[PDB]
Design a protein around this ligand. Sequence first.
Ligand SMILES: O=C(Cc1cccc(Cl)c1)Nc1cn[nH]c1
Ligand SMILES: O=C(Cc1cccc(Cl)c1)Nc1cn[nH]c1
Lengths: 304, 304
Amino acid sequence: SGFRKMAFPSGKVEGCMVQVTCGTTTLNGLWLDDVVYCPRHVICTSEDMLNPNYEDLLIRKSNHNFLVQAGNVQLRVIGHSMQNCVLKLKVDTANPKTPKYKFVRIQPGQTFSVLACYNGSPSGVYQCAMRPNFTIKGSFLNGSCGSVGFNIDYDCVSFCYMHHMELPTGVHAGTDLEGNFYGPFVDRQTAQAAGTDTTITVNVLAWLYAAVINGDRWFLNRFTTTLNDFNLVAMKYNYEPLTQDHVDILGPLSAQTGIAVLDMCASLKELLQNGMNGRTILGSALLEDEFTPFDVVRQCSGVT
Amino acid sequence: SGFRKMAFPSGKVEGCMVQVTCGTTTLNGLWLDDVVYCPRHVICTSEDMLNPNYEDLLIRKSNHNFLVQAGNVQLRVIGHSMQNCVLKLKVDTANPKTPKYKFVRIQPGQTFSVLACYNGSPSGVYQCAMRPNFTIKGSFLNGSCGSVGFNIDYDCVSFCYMHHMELPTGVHAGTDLEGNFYGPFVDRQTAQAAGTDTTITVNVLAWLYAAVINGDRWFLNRFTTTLNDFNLVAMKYNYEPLTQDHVDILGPLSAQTGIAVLDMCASLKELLQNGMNGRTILGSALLEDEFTPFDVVRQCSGVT
Ligand SMILES: O=C(Cc1cccc(Cl)c1)Nc1cn[nH]c1
Ligand SMILES: O=C(Cc1cccc(Cl)c1)Nc1cn[nH]c1
């Protein structure tokens, strides 16, 4: 009973957090095996984030300029390289707490947990999603750079995000663990506006299924729709277009509740057209889109 | 930038989760030093949760009937005792992963993180609050019993909650780590209705301060109120009465923003009287009450 915005247990990732200092800039690194991953802007001063030439700035840095501290003990840096917008710091010691891991690049609409860190130390964990405009709506102050986003499948941590930047609009931009930014963002102190933040339609439907499973059924109606009819309404409300792939992924939720995906689309169509009318669904007064269909099944079944 | 429902990093608590089996019932235990804490209903069959006499049921149980497994290794039970609604299982081995810890009994309005577990294994972490009716709005399926609620101050885990029961209304009831239930709930399969779920006024005000700090200011008005005037409105909307202790605790948030607590009370009074009018505050279309003033400061300052 109950449905919550739930993050993955963060222990496996906590054992990987380290502090990286270069010059006067300090941020977080991720220590997996004998490599520490961190944003390449650790080599910049605030006075040079305006137009950095990372390759030129890196020439003035040696292994001994990267101060890596895991807890209260210093790691010896024996190599360094830049891969896209991340630095890979080869250290002389393999992290004994390295979990089974993968580096994955996620698609918009996919959710992940963030272990927010400052000075290599974890402050909190929250669940968020890669927005359709490739931003994330996080909670990150200065110094949170290098904090990572991840998913867990039994004992394997799939790292998908590394935090780099806050846009002037208070939304967040970062890279996958290969250093490639999600979206068109660059690691520069220049105005970069985000595109339309559309709603993740398949996730809203998954969350409506979760609501039915937990007793919130007031929004269920006597109607049905088609993918093309639904999508006309989705376009009008800045919702992502629903495809047959999305319908397929909602299959298990549809099978569990006995509510056809297109009937749930009609319920969502009425919610968009009429609003909530002062009512709530799973404690929310707006349509939640940061639960994937997989998250709903996982939480509703008790996967560990 | 950004404000999220954030849980504490769960690693310290993950290292304490074990599985406890008695007969055919399996739930979670908390292993701290050489003692495993778990709900006493682990000794019950579903056929006897209707009217259990725990003292009589416990007479038929010996140390060897409590199967305690930490990961894939079995702990030897050398003693057992019942303290209120929890069982304390003395094991022959101190948990090497025991963090610095305390057992605290929280007041309504206070928030904590829950590490939801099944079969001694963590599934997720979420932030919730002790409701004014002494229930919690969690996410707990059968077998989640023994999952714990906690807070962390640097390296010390203060355990405040152990999950025991779901009420027929889908809300949750549990105990502190001394086995005393929060509220009037008993560990029996009998209908127990919760009281009025009032809104935690001081937490809503703290969250309104967090919204101002992060840029959401549309709700700020030209008005002020008094504690007695505000409380008349709070009574009408099932909000907890605001006291001078609550005003005092909001002092640092008032000092940071330059917004007098009573002026913020007037903003909240208008929000209650007029609603949101289709608008949102920190991504929410309702007034959030599960952030304490301490949570807002901690998150807004980056405490680790
Ligand atoms: O955004 C930054 C620094 C920065 C400026 C410009 C570009 C880059 Cl890569 C990084 N600080 C931040 C605090 N919280 N989240 C991010
Ligand atoms: O509530 C229970 C079992 C129970 C019944 C009656 C009393 C007691 Cl103590 C415990 N199952 C549950 C699943 N999720 N959360 C709780």
